[PDB]
Design a protein around this nucleic acid. Structure first.
Lengths: 108, 82, 97, 92, 92, 108, 97, 82
DNA sequence: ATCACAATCCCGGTGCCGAGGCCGCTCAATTGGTCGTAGACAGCTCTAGCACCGCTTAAACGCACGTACGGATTCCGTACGTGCGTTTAAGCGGTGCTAGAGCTGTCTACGACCAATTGAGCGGCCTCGGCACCGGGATTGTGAT
DNA sequence: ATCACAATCCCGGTGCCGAGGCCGCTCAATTGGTCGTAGACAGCTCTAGCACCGCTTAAACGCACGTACGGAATCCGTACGTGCGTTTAAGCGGTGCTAGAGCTGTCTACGACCAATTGAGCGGCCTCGGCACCGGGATTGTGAT
């Protein structure tokens, strides 16, 4: 036998290709699962995770914070158009809201 | 037998919820209407959650039952509360 | 001396939109949830996380509804939200009314 | 022994923000997000296989589900990343 | 050789309103309705099975999914009908 | 070997139990399908069909017609509160709308 | 002799809420659909039933939107629907605004 | 190549659609806004329908592609428009 | 523009509890080989989508005209917001008791699989019955008289 | 209040095409036997949900007071709706051409499955450091002047 290599490392990914394949097989999605489908799915999931964490880290740094909290994820999602469109029907627990006051309610 | 706990949703709490919504001025009839709206929402979520609990043959409503019920209503929730 | 009406309201709006904590007290909300649930099944138990999750979802729902209600009140050239604003917002959203 | 994505989300986080941490509640949010996107993509791919009378979910179905679910530039970059990963995997 | 519920819908129509016909456009509407309700109930039953780590869809899952999908009086009467049919079938 | 008998006739149904069982089995819904699940599902589908057809036939008879058309189905659905809740996100082709004029727009 | 403003409008409301036929002409709608589709793929063909289904869905969507818009206009104490009414109705529905 | 076919949705057609919705008086600026709204809705539906068509390796958009694309938007349609 | 002062931001200076690292091991991922079938591909037929054209007539368009409606203005009465002293009950931390959630082991009934039988459903053909249309008449409904 | 007359309901009378009935066949549903395991049930542990209670103190409540806002009434001016003559292009029917939808047959590469191997991740413990909070101090936002 050759030295074992994870399929994630073959595809250059951090998300686990094997676990994605196992979840696809056991989820009653189809009778058979092709070889490239778990790789493609892991790649897409990793990309979306990276996008959200980059935006949330920027939001955390803007507040001089080191750790990301749910508020930073909420700010990242609601301030970015595509993420706000994808996550439109989603509530973030302890995310709060975007600061927004209607102009007619301001003084003078 | 618990009764009339809807008045535990006080006027100051409703005012805080409206302030987070950006409301500046609140009519006096808003509080009872809000109580009705909240009761309807809770009735529909809790009915679905209790259905999920009874299917599992459990007696204890879990957080995951509530999460699935909110997913029924089109109210997907990420994370959890305490 | 005394603040004009609306100054404290604008301060409160700024404060509560800055924060993320729960706005309904926990014990009354938990009593409400248990009272509602007794009508579906007697002698139910609840995980604490279950009631917490319910409170988070409920408060999010009410805040979104109040935002829509405020839009309707402003559409009517008012600054005061009224029950008819809530009725219109819920009807447009597709709720039971 | 429940399974979650915290170790991979943390790895990706250190790839994009080396000096940035994350709290456990934000990590729970991230786990919910990954699980939700997985359910959406897999369900759309299963529908695509069923509509075309196919018994296998391949990378074509995943790509079409990605185009159906993700809006705009997110879809374009996600498709690019998936194609690159599959190309790298096939040459291994 | 396409598949439709047309003959069964017609049988039910002849029981419910013996003197009443139906147009082919209205029969297409009925077919769409039957297929949509089928997909809703089956998907909710499948989710119920997956949540509880079960591998079989039984009449219990169908009953729970109907209680989840149908509102009020409709759910109670449909549950009554399903239980009655299962009881008659078991005694055969 | 006895004479064949349909599972629909055993359960006293007009909807086909065998076709429902085959559709459940091939729909990637679960690994296994119980004996009573198609019977229960067929009974529920038949009941809902009968409920809708009764209301639509009433509407058609009220319109002095003997044939049900999509307008009758739309009228029946939108006038029954339960069916309106069930079919609230559904568009009926050629269904039209419910006649409804707001009172403020009426004369004098 | 001539009818007062609104009498013919009310008659038209009763007539068009009574009927079920398509309110947009078929050739212009088909040309619009093909012109839109040419941006996503060149040399696309269409089944006739596909364009018919698209028109049915589009007309239903527009009629529902006008119902909601009319509610918004009445809420403002007007009888004329205005673009701000459409904007409010679409925002509350969650549409792309 | 087709150009500027949105104007084929005429002012009287929009008036008829408003009448079916119970609208009594219409502002003059409503017609362009309605055209914009229709163009957005059609763009989304047609993009999804063409995605379904392309996945099938077809060159003809079927009515079933349109019904799936409408089901994606949350706009389930019974029957076919013909 | 001035002035008072409450609210708000800024800069350290700690505590504390949770984020993050370390380690043993077990259980899921990986490797290699065998086999059957899913689907890729080619080739063929024949449907249905597209182009185009000429006529007819319903629909669209442009314009005149008047009035109904939208929007601005004013006025007023009270229902709201703000502040403060008093009462309430939420939150917290501790304790005790037990329902029931989660797990493990046994075994048996149920559902998959398969081969043979067979009858229900579907496609095509055919013929009348429901329903939209038309015209002549009575009903009713609107706006100036 | 009345009337002309326009919109609308009644009452039949031929057409006409779609509904619905009928028949042969094929392919999906049924029946009977075998067997593997999913799950029903029993029994056990020990987690975590519930009840109760006493203190602290923040929040809720009730009331006084004043003014900002909602609602009503008035007025005006112009952008709507309605009617009519002219233009436009949709709809229809027919003809012709061909792209491509749908099906069938062949074959082979891919994915399932199984047994052995091993390393990735998970739970548990441990420890420092990020952040919350507090207090002292400077700034500014708000209201009367």
């Amino acid at each position: 036998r050759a030295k074992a290599k994870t399929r994630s490392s073959r595809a250059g990914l951090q998300f686990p290709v094997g676990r994605v394949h196992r979840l696809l097989r056991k989820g009653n999605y189809s009778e058979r699962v092709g070889a490239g489908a778990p790789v493609y799915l892991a790649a897409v999931l990793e990309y979306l995770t990276a996008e959200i964490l980059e935006l949330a880290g920027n939001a955390a740094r803007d507040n001089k914070k080191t750790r990301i909290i749910p508020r930073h994820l909420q700010l990242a999602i609601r301030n970015d158009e595509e993420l706000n469109k994808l996550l439109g029907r989603v509530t973030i627990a302890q995310g709060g809201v975007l600061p927004n006051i209607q102009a007619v309610l301001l003084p003078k | 037998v618990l009764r009339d706990n809807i008045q535990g949703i006080t006027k100051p709490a409703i005012r805080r919820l409206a302030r987070r919504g950006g409301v500046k001025r609140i009519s006096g009839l808003i509080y009872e209407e809000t109580r009705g709206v909240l009761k309807v929402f809770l009735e529909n979520v809790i009915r679905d959650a209790v259905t999920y609990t009874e299917h599992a043959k459990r007696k204890t409503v879990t957080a995951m039952d509530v999460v699935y019920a909110l997913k029924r209503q089109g109210r997907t929730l990420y994370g959890f509360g305490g | 001396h005394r603040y004009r009406p609306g100054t404290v309201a604008l301060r409160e709006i700024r404060h509560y939109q800055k924060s993320t904590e729960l706005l309904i007290r926990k014990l009354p909300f938990q009593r409400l949830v248990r009272e509602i649930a007794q009508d579906f099944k007697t002698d139910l138990r609840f995980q604490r996380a279950a009631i917490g999750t319910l409170q988070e979802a409920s408060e999010a729902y009410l805040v979104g509804l109040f935002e829509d209600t405020n839009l309707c009140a402003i559409h009517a050239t008012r600054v005061t939200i009224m029950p008819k604003d809530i009725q219109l917002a819920r009807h447009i959203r597709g709720e039971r009314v | 022994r429940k399974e979650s994505y915290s170790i991979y989300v943390y790895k990706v986080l250190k790839q994009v923000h080396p000096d940035t941490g994350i709290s456990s509640k934000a990590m729970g949010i991230m786990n919910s997000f990954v699980n939700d996107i997985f359910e959406r993509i897999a369900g759309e791919a299963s529908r695509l296989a069923h509509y075309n009378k196919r018994s296998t979910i391949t990378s074509r179905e995943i790509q079409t589900a990605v185009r159906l679910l993700l809006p705009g530039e997110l879809a374009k970059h996600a498709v690019s990343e998936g194609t690159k990963a599959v190309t790298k995997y096939t040459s291994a």
